[PDB]
Amino acid sequence: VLVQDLLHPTAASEARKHKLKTLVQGPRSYFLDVKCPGCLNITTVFSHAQTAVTCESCSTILCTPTGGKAKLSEGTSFRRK
Template identity: 65%
Template sequence: MQNFKLDEPTLKNLIRHKKKRLVQSPNSYFMDVKCAGCYKITTIFSHAQIVVPCVGCSTVLCQPSGGKCRLTEGCAFRRKYS
């Protein structure tokens, strides 16, 4: 009998379609994005379908691209884990 954990995704399992994985999980996530101009942090959905402006200086943080949103050059981000 093999000993492996179901909650730890393997590389092969991450590449699969979200519904064909051993444990179903979405491809989307939330992330904290730091503005390059004013260094304010904004929470953005990875598949945002609208242009997201910065709260402090109103510069564009991300643009929709038909799937995952495209971050503006110079913005730093980190993925949020639950």
């Protein structure tokens, strides 16, 4: 009473699925590029970074580790990938 061709499932259903319960297990997290206020330095960081990453030149913390996702420090201009 639950019909779906698993050969070609919905991308919405795969996105709502668990990360390993996907048809191909892939990672759900990603990376980011940030621009600091102190030096405008673009830095690549993890979306789920367990470390409080700072900028290189200005010692300005970019993100804070909290459980699942990393919480960015305020006033940092970011981009996906």
